[PDB]
Every structure is written in C-alpha cells, then in structure tokens.
Amino acid sequence: AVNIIKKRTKPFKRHQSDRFKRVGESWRKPRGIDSCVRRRFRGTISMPKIGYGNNKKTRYCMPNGLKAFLVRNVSDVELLLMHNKTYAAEIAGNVSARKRVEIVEKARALGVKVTNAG
Amino acid sequence: NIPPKARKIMQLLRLIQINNGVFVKFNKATKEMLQVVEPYVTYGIPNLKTVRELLYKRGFGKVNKQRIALSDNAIIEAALGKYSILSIEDLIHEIYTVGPNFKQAANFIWPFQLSSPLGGWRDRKFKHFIEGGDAGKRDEHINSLVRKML
Amino acid sequence: GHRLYVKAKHLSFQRSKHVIHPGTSLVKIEGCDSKEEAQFYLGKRICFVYKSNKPVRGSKIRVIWGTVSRPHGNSGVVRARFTHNLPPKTFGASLRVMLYPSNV
C-alpha cells in the first residue's frame, strides 16, 4: 500500500467506438483478417495484454492504500473490525439514508474509513 | 534466416542468441564446425584479462539448470568440487589453460550474455574479418571485441 | 540586477526519422560548439520560463525546471530531462542554462 504505481491509466477503448454509435467502448478483441489493430501497426490503438498487470502488492488498492469493501448494513461494516488499516467501507447505493446514517456511525466508531460518506 | 546446418551447429555450441559468447577447445571437430558457421560468428584467442573479466562480471553458472551468478566460491565448489575446482580463480585457470575437466568447467558456465559493443562494429558487420567485416576468425582482435562488448 | 544564465534554444525531442521521444529534449546552448564543451554544461539546471493569464501566488510567471544529462551530436547540442516534458509548441523557444550545480 506504499508507492502505488499504475502501468496504464487509459481504459482501452474499443476500435471504431469513437466513430460508430452502435459500437460500445467496452473492449472487444479484433478478429478481422485485415485488422491493423490486431496486427499492432504503429500508430494504432493498443490492445490489453497481461504485461499491463499492476504489482500484486499494490493491486486493487485505492490511492490512499486501502481497498473499497462494499457494505450494505451495520453487520457488513462490523466485518472490518480487525482489517481497519487495509479495507475502507463503501456504502451500497441502494441503502436508504436512515440505514446509511447508522452505517456511517458504526464505521466512525470502528475507525473504518468511508469512501462515499455524505 | 539461418540454414538448418548452421542453426544446428550454433545450438550445439550454445550460441542461440546474438551477442552470446562461449569458450571452446580448438580441435579438428570444433574447427570444422566453426568453418561452417563462419558467416554467423566471430572467434579468436582470448587472453587472461579477457577470460578473468568475463568470468568476474558476466560469470553465471548452471546449477539445477538455473543461471546463477558466481557471487561466491561456494557455488563453484558445490558444482565442480569433484574436479578440484573450488573457486572462481581455479575456474579461470581451467578455462584459460585447457585442463582435464575443461568440458565440465566450460559447460557449467552459462553462455555469456554480452552487450552491444561500445563504439559499434565496423561499417559492415556481416562480412568476413579479412574483408573488413566482423565475421570469421580475428585472432587476438577478439580481445578488443570482448572489451567493447563487456 | 543582471543575468546569471547562458542562453539556450529548445530544438526538438530525441527522435528518429519518424518516431519521437518527448521524455528528453534537444537543447542548443549559446557558445557551446562541441561535445567537449558540452561536458561543462552536463548536469547543469535548465529552466523554461513562460507567462500565463491567471495570477498564481501573485505572479504571472511559471517556470519548468530540468537537468542537462548528456551531449548530443558533435556540435555542442545537449540532451535535457525536465520534471514536466516541454511542450513541442516551444520548439525554437528560449531556455536558460543556470550555473547552480557548479564545480569551477
């Protein structure tokens, strides 16, 4: 959780998704017989590869060195009593404001950081 | 673009990558093999300085089929202790003066991964050394090549 | 008050015929006509000074710093690495080579 370095920050947009609206930005492997992107010609977009994989020690870590653990209730928040310095609670979006208040209070009492507090 | 015969010889000489160096004992068999692979390799007579610099900086031994740096005499003693080779110094002695266990001493050493020469090669690299290239026998000029390549 | 820096020009990035490397910049220093003279300026701090439109901290002047690394070519041109890569819109702009890490 120290010196977190990302090899690549771009999201690997799909080819021609910027040109055609029916083509989503979610990555698809090009499989054309004359695909310049697949052949990796100079100046074309890069394809996702295993070499882009981030360090295992810093993988899944937020810039603060924590991992955003999703919590839906106070019982979920209590799961991070011992793992306070590695996991940070993220309140689920479908949780009501009344239960979110209790979740925030429990996280504050346990010292667990909240990624989306307030 | 390597012919099958030259490719097989270089595999048997453990020269499977560019800028790779090995020690061989010069006999009729090795001389004829080097003659066949003349366009693809250079070879010559190394001196004591070249041999010791190679084994001290690029010295890697093959223990358990692994490339391990010769950072301690214990590794050499474990690998070649049965041949009375207990240190990098007598490993250098066995390599320089071709002794009884030269085959074991040379096979234990991983092929040297030399860098590109400092100052580059000649104007055209893939001509013979006699013609002005960097191929074939070069006699003592292998020492200068290794010095640039180390 | 006068100047304590040598004038310099930002020529281009390190590049081949068609491939550019914006991580290093080519700098021509006034009065440096050989790679032997470039050895004196090796390691010297070099700054690009430009103006802006928003005052920041009361000053409208922004400076990008860097260090000369190695000579380039035979005519005294040097390679420099900056904290932020110099924008290529500054190709041909003025840079200041300081004497801050001096050894004379």
């Binding site: - | - | 008050g1 006068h2 100047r3 304590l4 820096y5 040598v6 006034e30 009065g31 440096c32 003279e37 004196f40 300026y41 300081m98 004497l99 801050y100 890490p101 001096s102 050894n103 004379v104």
Partner: protein
C-alpha cells in the same frame, strides 16, 4: 513492521580544493545572487561566507558548495576569526514544531530592526576590525567585492577562467 537496518554509514564530505577559507566566491542563487563573498570556514557540505558588511552587505550565512563559483582572486587573510563559533546550530532556525503561523502582522517583527539580537553585530564588528587590513592592503579588492557579477554578451562560462 520494523524495516531492515541499511548499511549506509555517514562519512565526512570532501570538498573541492578551490573552496579554501578566505577565497572569494560568487553567489549563484538566492537573494544575494551575483554577489561576491569571502569564505570563512567549511561546514559539512556548506561554506560559511560573508562579504564584509561595510562593503558588501551580505551577513554571515551558509551557502551550498555547489551553488558558488570559486574565484582565483588573491586570498583574504581569515586566520584569526574564531571559526569554531559558527556551527550548524548557529545558522539554525528556532524550534518551530507546533504553534507557528504565517499570516500577516508577522513581517514587521521579523525585520532585522526588531530582531537579530546582539552577539551577531557585536562580533561582526570585531571580526571586521581584524580582517580590515587585508582588504585595505589588497588593491581593488574592496571595489571588486562591492561590485556584483554578471554575464555580458559573448561570455562563455565553459571557456573563461574564474
């Protein structure tokens, strides 16, 4: 967890021979950039320098050995100046850990008038009295020190001597 103990022992800094005590140096950066000062002693990695206050106006302070250009001007005698007084703690800011603020109404108290107590100027007067004959005897030295340094057109630092 406890980190490993590194094997980087601290060893004394060895400086250039040109930065001898009494040498005239040119300040390259800072408030007094371009000024000419006299080296009194040598600290760990810095030099204790001061152009005499009756000519220069630069007080007794430190300067990084890299941020000065030594000049081949005739050396100024600094034999008796009590160099041992100037240490790292001498040019050390007060203990400011905790209650410190940098708002207004603080620059009227940090001015040298209502600050910089005695034993600074009082010792500087005595040290200047000791050092005065050397500058007086050397011709052009007083005006040379008072004059700042600048690069004129056509000046090439890599070829000119200092």
């Amino acid at each position: 967890n406890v980190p490993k103990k590194a094997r980087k022992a601290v060893r004394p800094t060895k400086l250039r021979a040109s930065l001898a005590p009494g040498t005239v140096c040119i300040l390259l950066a800072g408030r007094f950039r371009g000024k000419r000062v006299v080296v009194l002693s040598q600290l760990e990695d810095t030099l204790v320098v001061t152009g005499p206050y009756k000519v220069n106006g630069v007080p007794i302070r430190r300067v990084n050995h890299r941020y000065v250009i030594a000049t081949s001007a005739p050396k100024i005698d600094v034999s008796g100046v009590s160099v041992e007084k100037f240490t790292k703690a001498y040019f050390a800011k007060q203990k400011r850990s905790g209650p410190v603020k940098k708002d207004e109404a603080f620059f009227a108290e940090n001015a040298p008038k209502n600050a910089l107590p005695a034993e600074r100027i009082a010792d500087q007067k005595a040290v200047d009295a000791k050092l005065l004959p050397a500058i007086k005897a050397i011709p052009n030295m007083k005006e040379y020190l008072a004059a700042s340094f600048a690069l004129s057109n056509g000046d090439r630092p890599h070829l000119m001597k200092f």
